[PDB]
mmCIF file of C-alpha atoms (C1' of nucleotides) in Angstrom:
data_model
loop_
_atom_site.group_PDB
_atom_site.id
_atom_site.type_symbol
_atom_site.label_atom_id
_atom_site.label_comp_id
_atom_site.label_asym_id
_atom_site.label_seq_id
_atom_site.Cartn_x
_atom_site.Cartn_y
_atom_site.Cartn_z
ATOM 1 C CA UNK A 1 19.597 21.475 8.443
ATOM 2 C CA UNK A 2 17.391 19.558 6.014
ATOM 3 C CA UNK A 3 17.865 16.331 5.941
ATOM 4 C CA UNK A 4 16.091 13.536 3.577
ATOM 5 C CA UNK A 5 14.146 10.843 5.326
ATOM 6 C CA UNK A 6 13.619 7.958 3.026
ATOM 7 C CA UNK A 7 10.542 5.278 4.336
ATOM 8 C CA UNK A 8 10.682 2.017 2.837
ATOM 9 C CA UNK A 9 7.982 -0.353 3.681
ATOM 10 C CA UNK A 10 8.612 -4.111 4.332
ATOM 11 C CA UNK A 11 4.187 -4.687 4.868
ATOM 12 C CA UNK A 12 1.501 -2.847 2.748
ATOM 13 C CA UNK A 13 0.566 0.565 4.471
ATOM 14 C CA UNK A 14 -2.873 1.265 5.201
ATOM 15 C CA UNK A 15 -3.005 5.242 4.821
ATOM 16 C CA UNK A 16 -6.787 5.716 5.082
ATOM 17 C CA UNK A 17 -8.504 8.746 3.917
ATOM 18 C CA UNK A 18 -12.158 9.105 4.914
ATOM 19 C CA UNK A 19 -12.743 5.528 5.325
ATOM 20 C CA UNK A 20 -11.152 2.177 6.318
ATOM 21 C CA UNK A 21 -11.905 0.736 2.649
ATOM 22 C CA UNK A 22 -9.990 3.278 0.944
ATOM 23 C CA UNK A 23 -6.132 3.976 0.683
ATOM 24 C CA UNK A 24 -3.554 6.634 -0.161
ATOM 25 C CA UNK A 25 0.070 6.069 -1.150
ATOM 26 C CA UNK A 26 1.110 8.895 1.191
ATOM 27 C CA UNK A 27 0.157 10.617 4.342
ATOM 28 C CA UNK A 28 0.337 14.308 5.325
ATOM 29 C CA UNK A 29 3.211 16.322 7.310
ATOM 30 C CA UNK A 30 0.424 16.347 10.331
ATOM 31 C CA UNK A 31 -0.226 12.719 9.876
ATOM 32 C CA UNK A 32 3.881 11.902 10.392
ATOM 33 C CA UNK A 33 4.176 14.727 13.084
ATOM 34 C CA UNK A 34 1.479 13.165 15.392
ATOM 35 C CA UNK A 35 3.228 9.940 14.728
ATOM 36 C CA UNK A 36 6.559 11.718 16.109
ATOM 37 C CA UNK A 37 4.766 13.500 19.080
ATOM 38 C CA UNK A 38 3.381 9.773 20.029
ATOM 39 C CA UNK A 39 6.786 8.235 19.921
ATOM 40 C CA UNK A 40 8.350 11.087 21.446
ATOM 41 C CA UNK A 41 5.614 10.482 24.719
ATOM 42 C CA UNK A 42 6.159 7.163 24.758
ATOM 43 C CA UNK A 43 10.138 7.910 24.768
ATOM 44 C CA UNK A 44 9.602 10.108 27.107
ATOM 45 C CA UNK A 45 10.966 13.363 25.170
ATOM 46 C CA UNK A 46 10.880 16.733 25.276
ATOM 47 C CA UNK A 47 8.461 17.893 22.485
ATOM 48 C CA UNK A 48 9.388 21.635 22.628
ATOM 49 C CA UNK A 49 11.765 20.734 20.243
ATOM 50 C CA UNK A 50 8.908 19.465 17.538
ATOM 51 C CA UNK A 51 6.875 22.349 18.482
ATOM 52 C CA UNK A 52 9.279 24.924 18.249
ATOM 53 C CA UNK A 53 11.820 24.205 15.459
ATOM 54 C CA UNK A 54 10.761 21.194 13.224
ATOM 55 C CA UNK A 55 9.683 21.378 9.660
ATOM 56 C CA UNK A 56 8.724 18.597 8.203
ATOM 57 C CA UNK A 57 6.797 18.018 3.994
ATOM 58 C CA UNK A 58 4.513 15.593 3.257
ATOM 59 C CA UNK A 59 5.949 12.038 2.420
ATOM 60 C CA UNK A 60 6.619 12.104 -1.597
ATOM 61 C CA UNK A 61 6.190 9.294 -3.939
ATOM 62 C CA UNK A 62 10.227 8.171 -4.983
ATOM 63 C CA UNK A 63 11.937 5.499 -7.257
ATOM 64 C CA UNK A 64 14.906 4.161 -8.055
ATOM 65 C CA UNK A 65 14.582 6.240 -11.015
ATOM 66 C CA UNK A 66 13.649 9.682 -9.654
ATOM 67 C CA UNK A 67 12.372 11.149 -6.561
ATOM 68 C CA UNK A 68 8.560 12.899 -7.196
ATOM 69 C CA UNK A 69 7.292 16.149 -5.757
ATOM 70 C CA UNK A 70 3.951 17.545 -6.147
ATOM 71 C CA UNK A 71 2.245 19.385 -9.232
ATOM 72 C CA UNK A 72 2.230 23.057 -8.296
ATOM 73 C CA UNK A 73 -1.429 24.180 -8.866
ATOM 74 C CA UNK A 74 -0.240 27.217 -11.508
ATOM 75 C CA UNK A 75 -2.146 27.826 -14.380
ATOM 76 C CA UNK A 76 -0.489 26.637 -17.440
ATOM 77 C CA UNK A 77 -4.865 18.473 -23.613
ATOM 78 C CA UNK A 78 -6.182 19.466 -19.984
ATOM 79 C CA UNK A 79 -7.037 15.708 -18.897
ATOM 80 C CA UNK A 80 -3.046 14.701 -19.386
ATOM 81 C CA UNK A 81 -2.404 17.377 -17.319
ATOM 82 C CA UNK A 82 -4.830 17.340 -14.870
ATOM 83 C CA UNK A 83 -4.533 13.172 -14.357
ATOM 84 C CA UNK A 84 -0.868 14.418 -13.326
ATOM 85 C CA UNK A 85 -0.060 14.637 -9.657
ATOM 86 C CA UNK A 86 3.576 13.978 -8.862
ATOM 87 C CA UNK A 87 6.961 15.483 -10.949
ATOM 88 C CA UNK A 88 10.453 14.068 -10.495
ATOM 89 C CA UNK A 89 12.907 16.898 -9.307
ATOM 90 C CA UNK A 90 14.408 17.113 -12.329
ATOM 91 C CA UNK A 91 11.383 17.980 -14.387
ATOM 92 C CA UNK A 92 9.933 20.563 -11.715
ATOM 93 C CA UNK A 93 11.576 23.252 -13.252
ATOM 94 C CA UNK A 94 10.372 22.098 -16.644
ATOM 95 C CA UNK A 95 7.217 21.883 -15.616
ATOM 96 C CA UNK A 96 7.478 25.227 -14.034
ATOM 97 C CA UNK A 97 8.866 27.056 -17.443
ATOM 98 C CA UNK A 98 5.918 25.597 -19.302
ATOM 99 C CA UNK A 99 8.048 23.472 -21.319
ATOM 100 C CA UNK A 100 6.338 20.453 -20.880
ATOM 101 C CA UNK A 101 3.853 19.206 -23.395
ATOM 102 C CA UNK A 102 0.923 16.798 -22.347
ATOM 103 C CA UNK A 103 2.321 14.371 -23.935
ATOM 104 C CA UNK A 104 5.199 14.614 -21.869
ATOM 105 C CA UNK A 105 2.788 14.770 -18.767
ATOM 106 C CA UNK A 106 1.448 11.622 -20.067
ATOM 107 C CA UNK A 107 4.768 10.071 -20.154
ATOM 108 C CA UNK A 108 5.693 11.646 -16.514
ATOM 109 C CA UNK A 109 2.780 10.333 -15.085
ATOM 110 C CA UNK A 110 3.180 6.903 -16.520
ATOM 111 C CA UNK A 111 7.220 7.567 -15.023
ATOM 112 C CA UNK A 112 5.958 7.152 -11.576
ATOM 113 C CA UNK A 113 5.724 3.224 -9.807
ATOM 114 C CA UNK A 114 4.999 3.887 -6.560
ATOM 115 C CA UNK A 115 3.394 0.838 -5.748
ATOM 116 C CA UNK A 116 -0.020 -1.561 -6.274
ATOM 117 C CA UNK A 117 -3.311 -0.404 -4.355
ATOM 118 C CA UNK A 118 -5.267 -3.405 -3.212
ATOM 119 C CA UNK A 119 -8.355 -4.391 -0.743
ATOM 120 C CA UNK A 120 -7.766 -6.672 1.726
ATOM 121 C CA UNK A 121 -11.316 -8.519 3.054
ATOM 122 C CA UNK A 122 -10.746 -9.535 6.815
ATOM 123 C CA UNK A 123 -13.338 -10.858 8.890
ATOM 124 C CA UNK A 124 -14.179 -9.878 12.719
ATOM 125 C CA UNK A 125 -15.546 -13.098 14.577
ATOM 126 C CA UNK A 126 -15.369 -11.425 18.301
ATOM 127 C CA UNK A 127 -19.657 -12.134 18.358
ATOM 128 C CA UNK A 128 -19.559 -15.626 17.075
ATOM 129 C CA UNK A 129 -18.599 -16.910 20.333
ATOM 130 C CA UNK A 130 -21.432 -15.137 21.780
ATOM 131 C CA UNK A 131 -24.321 -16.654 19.052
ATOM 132 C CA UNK A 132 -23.723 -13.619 17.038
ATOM 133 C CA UNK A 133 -22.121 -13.444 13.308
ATOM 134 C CA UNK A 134 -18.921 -12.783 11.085
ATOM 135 C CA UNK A 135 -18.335 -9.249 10.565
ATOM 136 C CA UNK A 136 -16.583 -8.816 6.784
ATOM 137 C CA UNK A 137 -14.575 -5.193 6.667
ATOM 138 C CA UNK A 138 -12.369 -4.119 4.175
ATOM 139 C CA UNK A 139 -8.923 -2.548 4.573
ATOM 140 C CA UNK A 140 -7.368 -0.423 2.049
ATOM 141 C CA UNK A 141 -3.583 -0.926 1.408
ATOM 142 C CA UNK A 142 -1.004 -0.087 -1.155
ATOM 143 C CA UNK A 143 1.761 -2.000 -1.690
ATOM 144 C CA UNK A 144 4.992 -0.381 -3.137
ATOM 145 C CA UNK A 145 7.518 -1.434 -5.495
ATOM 146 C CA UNK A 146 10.785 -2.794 -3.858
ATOM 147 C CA UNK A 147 12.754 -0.075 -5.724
ATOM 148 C CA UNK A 148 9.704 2.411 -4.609
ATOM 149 C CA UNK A 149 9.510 4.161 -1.411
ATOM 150 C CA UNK A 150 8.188 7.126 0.581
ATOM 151 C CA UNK A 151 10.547 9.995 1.249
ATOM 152 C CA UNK A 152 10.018 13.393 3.484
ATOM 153 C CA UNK A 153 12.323 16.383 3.647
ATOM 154 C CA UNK A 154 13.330 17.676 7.640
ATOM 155 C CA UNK A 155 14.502 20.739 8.459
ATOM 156 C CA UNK A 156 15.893 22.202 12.254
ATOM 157 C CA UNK A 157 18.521 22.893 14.287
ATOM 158 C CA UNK A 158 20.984 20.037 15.576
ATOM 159 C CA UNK A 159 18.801 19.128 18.351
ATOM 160 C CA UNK A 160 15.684 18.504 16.919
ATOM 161 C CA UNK A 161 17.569 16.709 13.354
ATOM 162 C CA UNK A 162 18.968 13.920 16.253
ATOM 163 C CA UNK A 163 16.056 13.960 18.240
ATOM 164 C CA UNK A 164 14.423 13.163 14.924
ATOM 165 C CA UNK A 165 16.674 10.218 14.344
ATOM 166 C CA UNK A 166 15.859 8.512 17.674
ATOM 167 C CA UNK A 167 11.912 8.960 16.964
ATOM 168 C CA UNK A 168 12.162 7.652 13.374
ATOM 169 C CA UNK A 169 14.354 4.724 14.477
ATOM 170 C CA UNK A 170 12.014 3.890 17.344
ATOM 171 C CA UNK A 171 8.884 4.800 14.506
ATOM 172 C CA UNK A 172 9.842 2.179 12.015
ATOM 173 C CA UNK A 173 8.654 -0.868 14.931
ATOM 174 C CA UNK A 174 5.524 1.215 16.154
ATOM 175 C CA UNK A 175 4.742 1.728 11.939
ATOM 176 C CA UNK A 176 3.321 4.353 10.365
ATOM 177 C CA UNK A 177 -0.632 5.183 8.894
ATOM 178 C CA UNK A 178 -3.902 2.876 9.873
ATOM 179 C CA UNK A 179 -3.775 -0.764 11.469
ATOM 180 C CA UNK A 180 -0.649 -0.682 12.289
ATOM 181 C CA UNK A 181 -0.331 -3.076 15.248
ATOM 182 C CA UNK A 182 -2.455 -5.407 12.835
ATOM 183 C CA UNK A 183 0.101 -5.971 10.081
ATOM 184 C CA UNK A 184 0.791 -2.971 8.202
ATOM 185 C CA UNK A 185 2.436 -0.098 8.123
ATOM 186 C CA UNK A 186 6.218 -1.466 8.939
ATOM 187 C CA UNK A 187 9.078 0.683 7.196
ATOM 188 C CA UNK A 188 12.455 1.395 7.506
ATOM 189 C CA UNK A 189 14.200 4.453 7.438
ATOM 190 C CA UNK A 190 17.279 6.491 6.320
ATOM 191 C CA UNK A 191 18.559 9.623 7.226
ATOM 192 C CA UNK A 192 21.314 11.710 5.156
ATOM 193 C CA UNK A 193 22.252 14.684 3.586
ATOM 194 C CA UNK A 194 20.350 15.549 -0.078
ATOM 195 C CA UNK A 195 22.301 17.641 -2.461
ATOM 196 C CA UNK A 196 19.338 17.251 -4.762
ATOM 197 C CA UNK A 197 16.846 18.899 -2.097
ATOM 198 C CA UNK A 198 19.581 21.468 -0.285
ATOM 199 C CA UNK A 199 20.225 22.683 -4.208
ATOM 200 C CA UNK A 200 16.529 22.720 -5.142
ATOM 201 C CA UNK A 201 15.334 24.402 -2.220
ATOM 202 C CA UNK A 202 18.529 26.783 -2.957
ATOM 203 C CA UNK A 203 16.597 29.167 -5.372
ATOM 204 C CA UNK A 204 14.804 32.349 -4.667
ATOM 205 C CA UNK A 205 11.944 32.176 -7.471
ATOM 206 C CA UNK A 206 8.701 34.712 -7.630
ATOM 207 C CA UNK A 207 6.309 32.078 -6.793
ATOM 208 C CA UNK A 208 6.371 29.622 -3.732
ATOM 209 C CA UNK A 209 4.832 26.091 -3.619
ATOM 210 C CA UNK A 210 3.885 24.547 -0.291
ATOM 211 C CA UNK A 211 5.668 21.191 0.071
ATOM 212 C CA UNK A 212 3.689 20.290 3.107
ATOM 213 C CA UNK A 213 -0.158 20.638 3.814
ATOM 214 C CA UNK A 214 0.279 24.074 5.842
ATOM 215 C CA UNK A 215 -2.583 26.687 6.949
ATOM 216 C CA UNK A 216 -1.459 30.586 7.913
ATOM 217 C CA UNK A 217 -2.525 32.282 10.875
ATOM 218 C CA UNK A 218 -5.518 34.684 10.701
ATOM 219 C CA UNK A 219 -3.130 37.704 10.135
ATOM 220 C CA UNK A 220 -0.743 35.988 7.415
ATOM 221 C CA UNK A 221 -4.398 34.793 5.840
ATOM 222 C CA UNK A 222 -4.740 37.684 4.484
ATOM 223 C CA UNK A 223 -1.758 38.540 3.115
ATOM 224 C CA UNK A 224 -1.080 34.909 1.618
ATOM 225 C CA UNK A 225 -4.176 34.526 -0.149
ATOM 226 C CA UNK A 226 -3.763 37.375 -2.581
ATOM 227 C CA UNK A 227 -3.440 35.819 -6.167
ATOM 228 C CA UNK A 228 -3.089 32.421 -4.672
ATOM 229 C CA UNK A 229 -4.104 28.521 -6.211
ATOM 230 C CA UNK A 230 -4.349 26.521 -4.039
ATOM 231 C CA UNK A 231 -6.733 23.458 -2.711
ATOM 232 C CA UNK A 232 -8.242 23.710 1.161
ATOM 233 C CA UNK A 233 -7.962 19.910 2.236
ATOM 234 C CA UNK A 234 -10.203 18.928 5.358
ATOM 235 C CA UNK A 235 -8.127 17.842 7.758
ATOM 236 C CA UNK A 236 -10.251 15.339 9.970
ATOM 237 C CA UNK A 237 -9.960 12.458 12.440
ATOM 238 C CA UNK A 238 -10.331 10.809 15.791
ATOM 239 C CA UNK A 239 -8.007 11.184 18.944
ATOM 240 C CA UNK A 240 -5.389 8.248 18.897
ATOM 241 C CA UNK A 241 -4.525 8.675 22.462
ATOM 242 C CA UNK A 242 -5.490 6.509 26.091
ATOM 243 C CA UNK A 243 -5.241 9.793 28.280
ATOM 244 C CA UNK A 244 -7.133 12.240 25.811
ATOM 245 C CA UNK A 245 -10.437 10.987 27.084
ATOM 246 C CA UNK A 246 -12.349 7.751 28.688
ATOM 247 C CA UNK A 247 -14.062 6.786 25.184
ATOM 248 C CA UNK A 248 -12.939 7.797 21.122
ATOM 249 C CA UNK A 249 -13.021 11.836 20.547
ATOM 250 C CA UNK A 250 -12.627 13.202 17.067
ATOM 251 C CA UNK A 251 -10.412 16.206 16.549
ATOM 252 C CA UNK A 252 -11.862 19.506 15.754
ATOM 253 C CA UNK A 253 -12.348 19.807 11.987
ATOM 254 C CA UNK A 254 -8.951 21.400 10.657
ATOM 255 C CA UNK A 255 -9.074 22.726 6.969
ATOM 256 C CA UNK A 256 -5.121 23.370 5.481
ATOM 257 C CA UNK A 257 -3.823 23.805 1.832
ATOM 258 C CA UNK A 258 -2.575 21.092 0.339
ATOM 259 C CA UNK A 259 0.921 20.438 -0.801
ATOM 260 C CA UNK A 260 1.637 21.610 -4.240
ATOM 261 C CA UNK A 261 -0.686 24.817 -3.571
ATOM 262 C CA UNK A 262 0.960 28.344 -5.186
ATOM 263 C CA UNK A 263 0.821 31.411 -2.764
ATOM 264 C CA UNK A 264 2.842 35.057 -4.245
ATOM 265 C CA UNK A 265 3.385 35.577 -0.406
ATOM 266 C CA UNK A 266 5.156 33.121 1.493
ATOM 267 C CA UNK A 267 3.301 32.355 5.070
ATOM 268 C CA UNK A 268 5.074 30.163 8.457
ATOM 269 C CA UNK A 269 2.815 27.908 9.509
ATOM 270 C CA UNK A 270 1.901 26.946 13.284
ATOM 271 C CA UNK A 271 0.878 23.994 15.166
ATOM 272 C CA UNK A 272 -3.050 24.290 15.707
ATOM 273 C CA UNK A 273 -4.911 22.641 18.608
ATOM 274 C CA UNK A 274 -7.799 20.640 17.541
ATOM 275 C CA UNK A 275 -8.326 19.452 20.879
ATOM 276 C CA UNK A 276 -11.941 20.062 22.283
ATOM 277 C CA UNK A 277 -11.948 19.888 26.051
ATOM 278 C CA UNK A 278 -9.491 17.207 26.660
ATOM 279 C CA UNK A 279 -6.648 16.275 29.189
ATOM 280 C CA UNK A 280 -4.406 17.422 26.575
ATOM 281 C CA UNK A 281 -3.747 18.901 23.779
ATOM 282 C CA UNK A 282 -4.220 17.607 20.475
ATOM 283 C CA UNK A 283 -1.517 19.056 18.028
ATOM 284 C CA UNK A 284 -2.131 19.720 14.323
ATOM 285 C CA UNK A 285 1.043 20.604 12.500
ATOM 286 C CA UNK A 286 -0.174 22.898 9.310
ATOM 287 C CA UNK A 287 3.662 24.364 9.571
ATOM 288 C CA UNK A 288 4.718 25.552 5.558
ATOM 289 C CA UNK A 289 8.192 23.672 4.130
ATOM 290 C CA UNK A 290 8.034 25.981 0.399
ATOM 291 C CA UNK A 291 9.861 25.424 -2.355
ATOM 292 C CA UNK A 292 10.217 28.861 -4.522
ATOM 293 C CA UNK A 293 10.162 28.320 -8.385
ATOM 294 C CA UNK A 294 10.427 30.480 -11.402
ATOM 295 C CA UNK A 295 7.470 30.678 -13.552
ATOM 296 C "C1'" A B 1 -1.339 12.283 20.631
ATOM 297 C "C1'" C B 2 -1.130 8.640 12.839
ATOM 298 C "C1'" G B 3 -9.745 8.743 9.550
ATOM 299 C "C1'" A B 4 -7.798 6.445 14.453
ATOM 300 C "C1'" G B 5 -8.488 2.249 18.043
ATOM 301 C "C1'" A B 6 -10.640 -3.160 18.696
ATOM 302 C "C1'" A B 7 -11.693 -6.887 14.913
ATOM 303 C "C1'" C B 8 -8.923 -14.819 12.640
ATOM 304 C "C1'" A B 9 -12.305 -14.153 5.807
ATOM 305 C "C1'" U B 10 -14.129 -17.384 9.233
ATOM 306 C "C1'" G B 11 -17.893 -21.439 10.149
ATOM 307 C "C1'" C B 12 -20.045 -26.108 7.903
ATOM 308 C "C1'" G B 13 -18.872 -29.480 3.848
ATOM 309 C "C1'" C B 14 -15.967 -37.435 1.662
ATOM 310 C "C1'" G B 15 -13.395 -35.367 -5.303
ATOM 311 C "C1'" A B 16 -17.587 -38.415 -4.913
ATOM 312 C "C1'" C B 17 -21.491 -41.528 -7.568
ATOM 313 C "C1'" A B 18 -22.358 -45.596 -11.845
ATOM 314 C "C1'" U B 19 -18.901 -48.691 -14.671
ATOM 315 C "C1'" U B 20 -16.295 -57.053 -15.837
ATOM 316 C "C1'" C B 21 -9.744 -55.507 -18.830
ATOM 317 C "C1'" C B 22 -13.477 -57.334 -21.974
ATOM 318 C "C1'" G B 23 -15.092 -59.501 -27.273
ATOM 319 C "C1'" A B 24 -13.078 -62.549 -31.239
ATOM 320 C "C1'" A B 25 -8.894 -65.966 -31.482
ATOM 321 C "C1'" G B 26 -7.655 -75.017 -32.360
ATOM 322 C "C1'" A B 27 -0.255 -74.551 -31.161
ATOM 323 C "C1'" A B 28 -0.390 -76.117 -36.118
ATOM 324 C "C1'" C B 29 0.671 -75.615 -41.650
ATOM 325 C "C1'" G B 30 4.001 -77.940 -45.573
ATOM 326 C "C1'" C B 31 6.750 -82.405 -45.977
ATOM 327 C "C1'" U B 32 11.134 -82.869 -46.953
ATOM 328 C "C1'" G B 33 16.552 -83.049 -46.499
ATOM 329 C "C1'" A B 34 21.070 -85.751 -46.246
ATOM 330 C "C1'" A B 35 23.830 -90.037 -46.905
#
RNA sequence: ACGAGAACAUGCGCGACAUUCCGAAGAACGCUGAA
């Protein structure tokens, strides 16, 4: 049952990347299912139901004007095409076919308003009350166009789609991405039925492009990777958690293929552990949404 | 179990100092009009 999800953000998001000074206008599947598993805890829910049946993508750029998935990495001016990262629905098969032009890249890339990215420069004074200093740090945050929005595509059985609701509804207060619970990050969200999506994803193509940042077992490894482009993404970060540990313990280092990455042979994911000795385990979705094209 | 959590762009700071609404300037010029 897929059903769209679409985010739309009342503060500026934070959505760090390596650092608190930088920003992204989207986060990961992982990113969103940790958010889930939290909410579900604090809800007190069953999480088999994540574990065992969810699928989620990666949040996607959207507009009024189209909704934007990402550039499949197939082999097709290289700068117009290479500046290109997101492709409204409509022109994905285009794109696909080798119809497009770089002009037209140009013009698709220019299509997309996600938002404005902007610094924020806040100041810690915690020591100044102790004859210490002003800290100055910088937080990252992208602010998106009324009209503009984030959007994810979830598929499962009944169960999980409604336990989905509840932790989405109960998500949009706790926020989504980095300081939330200091002024960002507040969005709220829709669930319905996409005949765009359900129709897209409809098609049985020779190629397969992973919608969400996914990694495949050791055994589908080496099947998958057979004729495959494709971009390994680190996937780092620290334990958001007060029962994981006494003080802050980064995650084991987690390396998954990124969204828009072509594989001939199509992989499931599976929810790694990047836990390292804790009171609990640490859950790293790398599950694989794909979309199969024709190229 | 969201490159995450905690974190006041904050503290101090007179839109202020100097600067004549002055200078020149006769209320007086022609003497006529009507019956």
């Amino acid at each position: 049952v897929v059903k769209l999800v679409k985010l739309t953000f009342k503060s500026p998001v934070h959505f760090g990347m390596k650092r608190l000074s930088d920003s992204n206008h989207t986060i990961a599947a992982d990113t969103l299912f940790s958010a889930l598993i939290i909410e579900a805890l604090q809800q007190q829910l069953e999480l088999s139901h994540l574990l065992n049946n969810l699928v989620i993508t990666d949040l996607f750029p959207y507009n009024k004007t189209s909704y934007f998935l990402p550039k499949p990495l197939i082999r097709i001016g290289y700068k117009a095409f290479k500046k290109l990262t997101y492709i409204p629905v409509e022109n994905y098969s285009e794109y696909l076919r080798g119809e497009i032009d770089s002009l037209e890249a140009s013009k698709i890339a220019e299509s997309l308003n996600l938002g404005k990215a902007s610094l924020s420069t806040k100041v810690s004074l915690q020591a100044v009350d102790h004859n210490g200093e002003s800290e100055p740090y910088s937080v990252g945050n992208f602010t998106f166009y009324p009209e503009s929005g984030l959007y994810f595509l979830a598929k499962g059985n009944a169960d999980t789609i409604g336990q989905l609701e509840i932790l989405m509804h109960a998500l949009q207060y706790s926020g989504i991405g980095g300081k939330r619970s200091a002024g960002y990050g507040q969005f709220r969200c829709t669930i319905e039925d996409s005949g765009k999506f359900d129709s897209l994803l409809s098609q049985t193509g020779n190629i397969a492009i992973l919608l969400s940042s996914a990694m495949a077992s050791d055994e589908e490894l080496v099947d998958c990777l057979e004729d495959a482009r494709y971009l390994l993404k680190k996937r780092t970060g620290f334990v958001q958690s007060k029962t994981y540990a006494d003080q802050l313990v980064k995650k084991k280092d987690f390396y998954a293929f990124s969204a828009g990455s072509t594989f001939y042979q199509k992989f499931n994911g599976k929810i790694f552990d990047v836990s390292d000795n804790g009171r609990h385990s640490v859950y790293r979705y790398a599950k694989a949404f794909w979309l199969e094209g024709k190229i």
